[PDB]
């Protein structure tokens, strides 16, 4: 028999949140290539990629997991 | 027999959220290539790609998972 | 028999949070390559990539996990 | 016998006046009360109140007062 | 016999006035109260109140006062 | 006989006046109270109150006062 | 016999160009003159004059000159 | 016989160019003159004059000059 | 016989160029003159004059000159 109980409070009382500046790759980017051999798969990423600005007014996280067998 | 109970509060009381500036790839990007060999698949990404600005007034996350056998 | 109980308070009372500046790769980036041999897979990442600015008004995290067998 | 004379000049030659930012109470305000007794008058002010932004292009002030008997 | 004379010059020659920032109470304000007794008059002020931003292009002041008996 | 004379020059020649930052109470404020007795008047002030930002392009003041009896 | 040849490249690869603020003469200007004598030509410039904001996306300059006899 | 040859590259790869602030003469300017004698030409410049903000995305310059006689 | 040859590369790879502040004559300027004699030409410059803010994304310069006689 399995009767877990959770009464969790997960909280923030943030007053003010602002003036967040993210400037990835603000300058010149250059690649020059001569007579290369590639004999299998290529992934190439060039420039400014996958950059995140994440500014949630609440970013609070609860994870829970339960098993029996 | 299996009777889990959860009464969780997941919360934010954020006052003010603003002036978020994200400037990925603000400059010149250049690639030049001479007489290259590729014998299999190419993925190429060039420039400013997949960049995220995510600013939710609440970004709180609850995950839960249950199993039996 | 299995009866865990949880009364957790996970909290923040953040006053003010701001003027956050992130500037990765603010300058010039250059790559030059001559007559290279690649005999298998290539991942190439060039420039400003995968940078995160993460500024949650609450970044509180509770993880919990339960098993029987 | 009473013959006062005033030839006052009260002056400003202000060139430029601007970018005035007033942000009173920019964050969260909260009050919680349990089972209180008040036996006489209550004045209650809660939140952002009576805040002034006063930006006159001339705010010069002359006061004068005269009496006799 | 009463014949005062005043030729006052009260002056400013201000060139430029600006970028004035006033941020009173930019954070979080909280009050919690249990079972209090108040047996006479209450004035209560909670939050951001009576804050002044006074930025006159001229704030020059002359006060004068005259009496007899 | 009473014949005072005043030739006052009261002056400012201010060049440039700016980037004035006033930030009172920028953080969290909290009050918690249990089972108090108040037998007479209460004034209560909680938070950010009566703060002044006063930035006059001229703040010159002349006060003068005259009597006979 | 005269056969000059020029294959010049004059170039810019400017990425981003912006937020240019020019504020000449931002304050009060005053002139007062008593009973002056001028016995020949007068040029007078008073105030804010001949000021330039020049922000070309390309301002590259080639001059060339040739002579014979 | 005169056969000069020029193959010049004159170049820039500028990434980002910005937030340029020029504030000449931000304050008060005053002139007072009593009973002056001028017996020949006058040029007078008073205030904020001839100031330049020059922000070219490329300002590259080639000058060349050729003669015979 | 005259056959000069030029293969010049004149170059810049500037990353980021910004937050440039120029503030000449930011304060009060005053001139007062009594009963002067000027017997020939006058140039008079008073205030903030001829100031340059020059911020080229490339400031590269080639000068060249050729003669025979």
Polypeptide structure, described:
The structure is a homononamer of 69-residue chains. Chain A is mainly β and 69 residues long. Helices cover 0% and strands 52% of the residues of chain A. Chain A has no helices and eight strands. Chain A has strands spanning 5-6, 9-10, 16-22, 29-34, 37-38, 42-49, 52-54, 61-66. Chain A is flat and about 70 Å long. The two termini of chain A are 12 Å apart. The relative contact order of chain A is 0.40. At the A-B interface, strand 1, strand 2, strand 3, strand 4 and strand 5 of A face strand 1, strand 2, strand 3, strand 4 and strand 5 of B. It is classed as protein fibril. Keywords: Alzheimer's Disease, Amyloid, Tau, Neurodegeneration, protein fibril. It forms a nonameric assembly. The entry is titled "In vitro assembled tau filaments with MgSO4 and NaCl (15a)". Chains A and 8 copies are Microtubule-associated protein tau. The organism of A, B, C, D, E, F is Homo sapiens.
Give the oligomeric state.
homononamer
Task: Give the total of beta strands of chain A.
Answer: 8
Q: Biggest sheet of chain A, in brief?
A: none
β-strand percent of chain A reads over 45%
| Chain pair sharing the greatest interface | A-B, 69 and 69 residues
In DSSP terms (H or I, runs of 4 or more residues), the helix count of chain A works out at: 0
Give the SSE string of chain A. Answer: EEEEEEEE
Separation of termini of chain A?
Answer: 12 Å
Radius of gyration of chain A, CA atoms, in whole angstroms: 24 Å
The backbone outline of chain A, from C-alpha atoms, is flat
Backbone structural class of chain A: mainly beta
Q: What fraction, in percent, of the residue positions of chain A are helical?
A: under 10%
Protein name (chains A, B, C, D, E, F, G, H, I): Microtubule-associated protein tau
Organism (chains A, B, C, D, E, F, G, H, I): Homo sapiens (Human)
Subcellular location (chains A, B, C, D, E, F, G, H, I): Cytoplasm, Cytosol; Cell membrane; Cytoplasm, Cytoskeleton; Cell projection, Axon
PDB class: protein fibril
